[PDB]
Every structure is written in structure tokens, then in C-alpha cells.
Structure 1
Amino acid sequence: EILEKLRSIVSVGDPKKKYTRFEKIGQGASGTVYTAMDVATGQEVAIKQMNLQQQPKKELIINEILVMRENKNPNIVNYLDSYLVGDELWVVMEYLAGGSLTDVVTETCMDEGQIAAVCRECLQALEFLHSNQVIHRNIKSDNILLGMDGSVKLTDFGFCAQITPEQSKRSEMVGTPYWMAPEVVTRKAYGPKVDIWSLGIMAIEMIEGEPPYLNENPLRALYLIATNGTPELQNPEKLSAIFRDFLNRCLEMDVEKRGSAKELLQHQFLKIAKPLSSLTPLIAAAKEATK
């Protein structure tokens, strides 16, 4: 009954009177997401509402709130507060007007400059987390949020892990199959570089619209990751050499040879990044496409 630890972390007081103008903007396995407005303050917020029954290990909920409140950063969606509403947990975060990267990758064609701009900002989030001994473990386009200024922010700490010098590696088979690094899929001990792999897969989303093997069922994709290793692009000839190089460094099978987030921030690919204002036309296109 670590529900007591969860009960001591959360704020008390009715969120249903602190916040108004509730609108469902999202579903998800982890719960439903609503927008709302702080009754007093006017601030727009996103609230994730999670059924405590839905989650069998309430230990992960605790971990999610702590990591988020302890690791604030400009490239991470800001945690504001949390509340228990009966058997439902509400997490309140800053609302980022814009959209999901998923909408952009499925509905637009991104140029290398735009892709490099997104990758740089995500690598900055990862550098910060990994330096704070946190592995995200669920990097994908669905967890990247884009601001109306082209701000890029990472969210979702539902699956993350804290490591320590004593225990530098994890062994849970956690993530979303198509984005999971081979060492994770094959139950080897793994470290922060699983996030770099997932980032590589997200770069393939930005190129091709989908992670490798998405037409296949999840179990089949796990088999394909275990057997193929480094995925191949549909049309690699369409990419610059330096982009292909960046991809190769993100998607190295040899963990020790795979780029760290720090190493990758100095890659040549990132030097072609467009300014973040370059992403706002993608956001406009995606909103129009998903009317």
C-alpha cells in the first residue's frame, strides 16, 4: 500500500473548482487528456486523468510525478500539480498550443533543416535527462509537442527509469514496440542510449511518415527488430550523406558505438538546422489536414 506515498505527494483541493472549461483533446493507454483553464489565473492547462485501476503497479505513477517535478527544463512539458480524484489521478501540466509531432509527420513532408531542428531540441531534452540519471524509454513523435512559436517539448514520464552509479542499467521490457531498441527487445541490460535509438526511429518517422514495420502487428515488429537490427530506409538515396551519417550513429547496434546525446548534439547534421520558426508552417499544415 504505497498508495499512502502517492496520497502524500499530491495536492489536496478540488481540481474541479480550480480549473474550468474542460475539453477532451486526447485519449491514450495511460489515460484521457483534457484542456482547461485555471479559474483564478486564466492559464491554459492540460490535465491527464489516469484511472488507478488501469495501472497495476502504482509505483510507476509515483515515479512519474517525482521525475517530472524534479526535472524541469525548457524542452520538457512543465509539470504544474497533481490531485487524486477518487480512484483517478489528475496530473496538470502547461498547455502547449500547437500540435503533436505525429500530426506533422503523418500529414506533411519535412525538409532536412526542419528535421535537424526537431532532433536538436529533443537531443537537448535527452542530454538534460540522461545527465540527471533518467531514461525516458518511450521516445516517439507522439510524445513530442510543438509550440505555436515552434517550441519543441518532450512529454510522458509514465515509463521512465531512474538509474544510479550502483544500478546503471535496467532490464524491464518497456516502451512502444516499433520504437524500442534491440537491447530492450532482447532483454539485455540497457542504459540511456535506448533513448537515442528511439530518437533515430523518430527521425525515420519524420522522413517516411512511420517507424519501420508499422504495417505489421506489434509482436511481429518485435521479432523484426530482434532479427534485423539497424532498420533500412525505403529510399536512402533521398537523404544527404550527413543525415544518413546521423541516422547511422543513432541506430548503431553496438551500444558503446551508438552516440550519446552529448556527442550527437555536436553532429554536423544539426548545423543545417533551420530556426524553430520554420516549424510553424508544418503546424498550420497539420491543423488544416486534420480539420
Structure 2
Amino acid sequence: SSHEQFRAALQLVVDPGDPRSYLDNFIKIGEGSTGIVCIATVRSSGKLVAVKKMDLRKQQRRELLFNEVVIMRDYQHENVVEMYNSYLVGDELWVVMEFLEGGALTDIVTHTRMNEEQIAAVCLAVLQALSVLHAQGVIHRDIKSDSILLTHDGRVKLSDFGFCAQVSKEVPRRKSLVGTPYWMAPELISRLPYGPEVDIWSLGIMVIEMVDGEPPYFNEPPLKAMKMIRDNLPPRLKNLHKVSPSLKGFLDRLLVRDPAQRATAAELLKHPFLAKAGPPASIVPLMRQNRTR
């Protein structure tokens, strides 16, 4: 059947063999929409790595499994989690990656208020990554706080590229409904032709996460949230009167319904709000203590 075809094709783009020849003591530490995240130990090194496992049979869009392993192969950027190897183990794709020991931004957002120096530092890191990716024609398509990982010393890296897409001169736009509902851009929900700008909208929703503690419409059923994103004015900060005019002006350039008028990552790197961006040391306290909103 087509599963055997897809499996054979995937085997052609991953590394050969079974990584159980060198990885020990798998422990599940998390999960997302396509599979689970484990930690494992290198038998020779004592080195810790992260291993994502994705069952080919459980994917709504299995062809998307190719994209990450291929597009992000050998990708080296200071704000992108490094991928080391990938394997086909039975009916599962395993991707071996660098282990980020500060956890995900989501755990920060649910447990502590962030100040604007810290929000700006996160935005700056993500935009440095997106500026390079977008210039290369890569759309991430799952920007949200759970896709953002931290080191213990406060460095910020983008992960979870499993929904990513490649655009080009010949095919400059995608139309697939891909992402996580509450973060999806309205043109993407509408299945209109879209480009890298969808990531900028999603980043705007993540700024609302950092300020408010959750995205708009978060306890709404996801299909209803998507209709409200598609049809209503851009969502507002609950804590609108608590943020600076600079932060609001920045957000106003991200949450723009018309994708042609939404700011690009390269434009946003010039925005004065990002002059507030603190160094990694400013992020460290957020992983060690809690402060209520």
C-alpha cells in the first residue's frame, strides 16, 4: 500500500540503522501533536540527547515528516535547536536532537509574569531565527510558546519544525491548513495562498501569551476559535493597559489581518521595542522563581 511506499521513501532520507545501537535509557518527558519527546543517553559519551518519536501511521499529514528531516538537515543557527541524526525504527521516525535543559517557554508563561526586557529578548531571538529561515524560503508554521526552548543560562532556541514548508521562486506560496488552531494566521485558516508572514502572526499570538498568560480564545473549542480568528478583528491584549506604547506598537505590526501589510521578520528586527531586549542573564530568573501577573 501507500504506507509501505511512504516508509521506503522516508528510509531513503534518514540515517541507516537502529539508534538503539548507541542510545540508552529512554525516558518520555513530553509530547506534542506529532509524537513524543524523550531523553536518552549516549552509551559511549554519557551525553544527554533529546529523541522525538513519531509513528508514521498516526500522522494526519505524513508527507510533512519528510520536511523537517530534509529541510533542517545540517542547519546551524544559534537560535535553532540542532538536529543530529534521524532513523526509521519499525513504523516510527526517531529524530535525535540537542537537549535544552531550561524547558519550554510555555512553562515560564504559565508560572510567572515576564517584564518587557524579557519579552523583547525572547522576540529578538525568535526573529533572528525567522529572518534567516524566511530568507531561505522556510516557513515554520508552528510558532507558539511550546516551540520555544531555553538553556539554563537563558539562551532561547526555536524547535518543533515538524510542520515546516519550503517555498521558492516557482512555488512561492502554500495553502495547507497546518498549525495549532489558536496560533493560526487568518489567511491560513482561510486556505488562501500564504507565505512566511503566517509565522509573524503566530509570533504575535505568542506575545499575547507572554503578556496575558494564554493565547486568545484558549478555552474555546478549537474549530470555533479558528472561525473567530478568521472572521473577527485581530485579538486584543487582556492586559492592554499594563504594557508600554512600544510593546503595543510592536504587537500592532504582528497582528495585521492583511498579510501584505503585516511586518516581515527583517522589518521587525529594526523596531524600537527590541532595543529593550535583555541579555541571556535577564531570562535566567524566570526559570528559578515565580511572580504573579
TM-score by length of 1: 0.95
Distance 2:106 2:14 in 1: 31
* Residues 152-183 of structure 1: CA deviation (Å, up to 9, x unaligned): 01111111110011111111111111001111
Q: For each residue in 1:253-289, what CA deviation from the matched residue of structure 2 results, as whole angstroms up to 9, or x when unmatched?
A: 2222211000000100000111111111111237x99
- Please name the residue that 1:236 is paired with: 240
Whole-angstrom distance in 1 between the partners of 2:120 and 2:271: 10
Alpha-carbon distance between aligned partners in 2 of 1:254 and 1:13, rounded to the nearest angstrom:
47
Shift of 1:57: 4.1
Unaligned stretches of 5+ residues in structure 2:
none
Counterpart in 1 of 2:68? 64
Partner deviation per Cα, 1:63-95 (whole Å, 9 max, x = no partner): 120112153311111000011111111110000
Write the distance in 2 (CA, Å) between the matches of 1:162 and 1:72.
17
1:219 aligned onto 2:223:
yes
Counterpart in the other structure of 2:261? 257
Partner-residue secondary structure (3-state), 1:113:
helix
Query: Displacement of 1:32 after TM fit?
Result: 1.3
SS of equivalent to 1:197? helix
Counterpart residue type for residue 70 of structure 2: L
TM-aligned CA deviation for residue 42 of structure 1 = 2.3
The code of the aligned residue for 1:248 comes to D
Q: Counterpart of 1:84 in 2: which secondary structure? A: strand
Unaligned runs of at least 5 residues, structure 1: none
Name the amino acid aligned to 2:143. I
Structure 1 counterpart of 2:280:
276
Kept after mapping to 2: 8 A contact 1:182/1:229: no
Amino acid at match of 1:271: A
Residue matched to 2:103? 99
Aligned residues: 288
Match of 1:121 among 120, 125, 134: 125
Q: Distance in 1 between matches of 2:173 and 2:233?
A: 21
Q: Is the 8 A contact 2:57 2:91 kept in 1?
A: yes
Name the structure 2 match of 1:19: 23
1:240, 1:56 → 2: CA distance? Answer: 41
SS in 1 for 2:263: coil
- In the TM superposition, structure 1's runs of 4+ consecutive aligned residues that sit over 6 Å from their partners are none
- For the pair 1:172 / 2:176, whether they are aligned, the reply is yes
Aligned letter for 1:236?
A: L
Q: Say which of 160, 166, 173 aligns to 1:162.
A: 166
Given the two structures, how large is their TM-score scaled by the length of structure 2?
0.95
Confirm or deny that 1:193 pairs with 2:197.
yes
Distance 1:195 1:70 in 2: 22
Root mean square deviation, CA, Å? 1.6
Aligned partner of 1:30 in structure 2 is 34
Partner of 1:209 in structure 2? Answer: 213
Report how far residue 41 of structure 1 moved.
2.2
1:153 aligns with 2:131: no
In structure 2, what residue type is equivalent to 1:125? Answer: A
Deviates most, 162-171 or 55-64:
55-64
* 1:82 lines up with 2:106 in the alignment: no
